Design a protein around this ligand. Sequence first.
Ligand SMILES: CCCCCCCCCO
Ligand SMILES: CCCCCCCCCO
Ligand code: NA
Lengths: 106, 106, 103, 103, 219
Amino acid sequence: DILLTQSPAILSVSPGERVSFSCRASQSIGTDIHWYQQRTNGSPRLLIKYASESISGIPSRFSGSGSGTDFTLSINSVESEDIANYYCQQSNRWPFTFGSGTKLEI
Amino acid sequence: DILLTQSPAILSVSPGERVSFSCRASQSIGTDIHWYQQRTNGSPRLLIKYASESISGIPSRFSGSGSGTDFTLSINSVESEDIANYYCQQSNRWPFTFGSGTKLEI
Amino acid sequence: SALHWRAAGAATVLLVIVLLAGSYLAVLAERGAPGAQLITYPRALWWSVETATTVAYGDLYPVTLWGRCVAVVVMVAGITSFGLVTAALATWFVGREQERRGH
Amino acid sequence: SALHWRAAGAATVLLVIVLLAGSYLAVLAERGAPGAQLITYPRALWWSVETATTVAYGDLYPVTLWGRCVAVVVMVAGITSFGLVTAALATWFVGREQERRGH
Amino acid sequence: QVQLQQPGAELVKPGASVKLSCKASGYTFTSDWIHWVKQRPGHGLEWIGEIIPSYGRANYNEKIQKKATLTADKSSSTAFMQLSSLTSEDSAVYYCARERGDGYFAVWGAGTTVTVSSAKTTPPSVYPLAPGSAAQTNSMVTLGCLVKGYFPEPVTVTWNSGSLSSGVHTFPAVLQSDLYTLSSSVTVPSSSWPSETVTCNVAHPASSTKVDKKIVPRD
Ligand SMILES: CCCCCCCCCO
Ligand SMILES: CCCCCCCCCO
Ligand code: NA
């Protein structure tokens, strides 16, 4: 079963800066990684599919990159609404698994 | 995305000695590694293609070896004109990536 | 509308149907097997084409019993469809050569 | 210059053209997909030959939708060309056996 | 002949945009790809993107903030990179390189130095550096030229229109009050100067200027 390591567990950044969340897979999984945002008391919201593909309605400040075992979610110019937990999730092998999440702090 | 680690970042050698630059790939990439020399204020110049293949016009003191994850650029008998930064670059998977470079000091 | 061309057309139609059903059913058989990769429909469709043509690159394959049974149906459907196309071509060439010899 | 030999020659020519275009187009479809290996033309030509013969060693394969569509065209072109050669051989053997029986 | 031709420099105000060009010569193939590489001062090579001119499709480094847009004009064999809404983080040398579709960069352009700043373009003043009357000489004499008060980088300093290359150093510029200054040093056999002339040639591409200064003794 594929382990997704998200570290560091907390990222602190100043407003307007670029931030990058890391997701590392215990084995090579192509680009089968998806990224979700969950704000306090909210449901998770898909942000990026297949490592880099945009989702309609998601701000263009969000992008993704990587392939194989190493993946990155990036926000250009963080603002307050981006405060949330961020989760990666793989669909390359059964069962689907989730990373343990990274909190964004400003 | 393939990470190319070049370490050490600086190599110091005495004139006329043999020197070897190391390039290590984060995954196996056959012989799809190419080596470039960049002197101060100069453009990069291809030295070696596909890990070991000579380039016309490059001195025969330059050679390359390795395959898989471990690659070596070698200079037999370093001289002053060899002072430069040396970069490896992979073409095995998209996107092409570069190592962080090794400086030669005499 | 000779018989061999009709059977070629039917074979193509059935093969397309087999690719679609094989894709859907391979995903259904493989989910629940830890480590299985043949578990989303777009790449399952690619795998079914790989399997039917025998151009099996090895990027995807079933690990379960029912996924492998599905695979065997896809293999046999593809191999026999392409053999039937060859047989239709042979018949067409044979008829045309008989006319060319004036038999 | 019988029909089956002509169609074999045409098939060979078209297959070579398909290998060349498939190589070029696979590189065009696959660059921009992180992790893709089918991204330089010499090995793309080798991969197209692998794909057309069905001798798919698994050293190279497309990961994108359009690369896989290109692959399918190469597969079908190769498999049908080789089937057409078989059909031409069958026609030649059939004609020669009819003459040998004096029909 | 030079295979890839790029302008030496471009000055861009913060927030503005600039279109870099790369005119190609030599053998041209439908399998040709033109790549763009960013190098920040004292840093490594960073791949920006690629374009296949015969088809017009471009791909971009996904790991970095997308600031480039690649196009190509097949009629003039020229590839363009539009860099948009720049900050100082975009100041760098931008190289173009040609790859024959086989994975390596066979040839590179000379690079365009892009400076992102609100300061004003200023051509250099070029002054001679000849020894005073009490300096003594040996088998060699050292001369120089002082290139002062220019913006932005770079300047190219040659000696005797490039024919004099042995014995030349050009020092890195220092930046003060939004103006750069450097000097270049040249050493020749003392017997040969001033009988054989010695001139420095200072090109400042951002100002499109090229000035000469003969080094004559203080006599
Ligand atoms: C030959 C078609 C068999 C259909 C497979 C259904 C999957 C059953 C999983 O328990
Ligand atoms: C069947 C031939 C399709 C050609 C593929 C072109 C690549 C388009 C990439 O967006
Ligand atoms: Na086969």
